[PDB]
């Protein structure tokens, strides 16, 4: 701590599309959060303990393009809204939070870390409300604790009038569950 | 290219730090005074000058990016020195915080003007002065970010 983040783009529309079909990505990977994209929407995928997890709502059941072609998902849990592939070669993994901190920091796709107060297992209030447009694209992003440990993965925004007051997330425990789950 | 939120400045007499917050490049009056800042289009004057709070500010220079004020009330601060060292500090209140590990005043020299960050990397305050018992800085005075917001 303090939690600081930065973003780096690595592909544009045409490279992404070609890569989406060919399913072969030869670029180098770095970081613990990958800005991921399909032919329809773009979001994030967080690497926690050797596995690149993301929101099933975005990745669906797709494969991840890699240097050795497409990689099938390791886990898929439609109910918990999770999917995970082995973390790409080069990524760095976060580790689950072992301190039960009630103060969480959400990392957005623009590499911003905004504070949120854990309101209950899979919900937390934004200390400073933001437009829903600000959170768009940030699904599957990490919800960190003061020490930089994975508490959850951003899932949906709790908003009204187009302004987000809170956020729903997938508690890291559901991850350990999904893995143990026959899915 | 990459942009910095913290500029390392100099006035011949001394070197210290400035921190861009809310589009303004803030630093301590005891370093800059009412001096103007250098620019490739000539010197630019202070947008804000406040001797009473030891605060002066010019419009953020080039190659910089503004820092976001803190909104979590966290008291576990982090001080960034002119050498890019992060010194964790415990907030004792408003404008004072105690280092978790005291260090020779030298280690904090030239860092006045730099930021006091919270666990989200947001600006909590501006490092104003080091409080040192016998050459060992154990605490630091700082300008809370609200003063800057109130000065704007």
């Amino acid at each position: 701590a303090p939690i600081t983040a930065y973003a780096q783009q690595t592909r544009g529309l045409l490279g992404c599309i070609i890569t989406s079909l060919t399913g072969r990505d030869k670029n180098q990977v770095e970081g613990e959060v990958q800005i991921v994209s399909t032919a329809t929407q773009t979001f994030l995928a967080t690497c926690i303990n050797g596995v690149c997890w993301t929101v099933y709502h975005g990745a669906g059941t797709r494969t991840i393009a890699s240097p050795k072609g497409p990689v099938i998902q390791m886990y898929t849990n439609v109910d918990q809204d999770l999917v995970g592939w082995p973390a790409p070669q080069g990524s760095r993994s976060l580790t689950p939070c072992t301190c039960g901190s009630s103060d969480l920091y959400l990392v957005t796709r623009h590499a911003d870390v905004i504070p949120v107060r854990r309101r209950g297992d899979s919900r937390g209030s934004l200390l400073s409300p933001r437009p829903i447009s600000y959170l768009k694209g940030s699904s599957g992003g990490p919800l960190l604790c003061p020490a930089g440990h994975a508490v959850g993965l951003f899932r949906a925004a709790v908003c009204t009038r187009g302004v987000a007051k809170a956020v729903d997330f997938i508690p890291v425990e559901n991850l350990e569950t999904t893995m143990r789950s026959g899915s | 290219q990459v942009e910095g939120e913290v500029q390392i400045v100099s006035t011949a007499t001394q070197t210290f730090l400035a921190t861009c917050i809310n589009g303004v490049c803030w630093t301590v009056y005891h370093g800059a005074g009412t001096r103007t800042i250098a620019s490739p289009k000539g010197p630019v004057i202070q947008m804000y000058t406040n001797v009473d709070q030891d605060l002066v500010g010019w419009p953020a220079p080039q190659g910089s990016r503004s820092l976001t004020p803190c909104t979590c009330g966290s008291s576990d601060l982090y001080l960034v020195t002119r050498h890019a060292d992060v010194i964790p500090v415990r907030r004792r209140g408003d404008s004072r915080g105690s280092l978790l590990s005291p260090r020779p005043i030298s280690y904090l020299k030239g860092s006045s003007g730099g930021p006091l960050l919270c666990p989200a990397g947001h600006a909590v305050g501006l490092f104003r002065a080091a409080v040192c018992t016998r050459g060992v800085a154990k605490a630091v005075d700082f300008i809370p970010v609200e003063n800057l917001e109130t000065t704007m």
Partner: peptide
């Protein structure tokens, strides 16, 4: 005199390129 900028510090530690 005038205050000149002699260096810059990136808090995220960003090495280079675009976001």
């Amino acid at each position: 005199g005038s205050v000149v900028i002699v260096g810059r510090i990136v808090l995220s530690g960003k090495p280079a390129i675009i976001p």
